[PDB]
């Protein structure tokens with residue numbers, strides 16, 4: 001069965017970084033696009049970062065650019081988010097996202113499933 | 115018409131079978147169960163270059 005499990009979150013101090021991990025099960029990892037979304041209380045939803053199967057295309061939002069880094073490894077079957085210089089805006093509920101068309105965007109078929 | 119004539123003498127004759135019986139056709143075979151994995155190659159998300 002398809003599940004995505006997020007771990008590594010917690011409380012941090014300014015100037016301190018942390019490590020997020022996204023471990024998932026039930027589907028083959030080597031052909032799917034994965035993305036990060038955070039949910040802060042009562043301000044809707046906003047995108048963080050993403051990755052594809054080849055990881056050649058990596059994108060960040062300009063508000064969060066320059067201090068995040070997304071990484072992924074097939075052997076350990078998990079998605080990794082690297083934080084640097086954590087600030088006040090970072091306080092949100094972080095979601096881990098899988099796509100259905102192995103790529104970021106642009107195609108006729110794309111969508112967030114699990 | 116099995117003696118090939120129109121007059122027959124007294125006695126008992128051993129004729130042949132000229133009545134025609136219609137027939138049908140039938141065929142049976144075992145249970146098709148072990149299909150080939152065509153979906154994996156024809157319905158894959160990504161194709162190699």
Ligand SMILES: *[C@@H]1O[C@H](CO)[C@@H](O[C@@H]2O[C@H](CO)[C@@H](O[C@@H]3O[C@H](CO)[C@@H](O)[C@H](O[C@H]4O[C@H](CO)[C@@H](O)[C@H](O)[C@@H]4O)[C@@H]3O)[C@H](O)[C@H]2NC(C)=O)[C@H](O)[C@H]1NC(C)=O
Nearest residue numbers: 100109148149150151152153154155156157158159160161
């Ligand atoms: C690749 O994947 C696609 C999509 O997953 C697949 O095409 C689909 O094939 C199924 C095969 O069953 C199609 O399902 C049929 O749909 C028609 C209407 O379009 C229905 O009338 C059919 O109903 C019969 O079968 C049912 C059992 O499934 C019975 O309960 C019923 O009484 C009928 O006898 C059936 O549901 C489906 O429509 C297509 N979809 C598309 C978009 O084409 C394709 O076959 C896959 N390719 C390979 C090579 O496997």
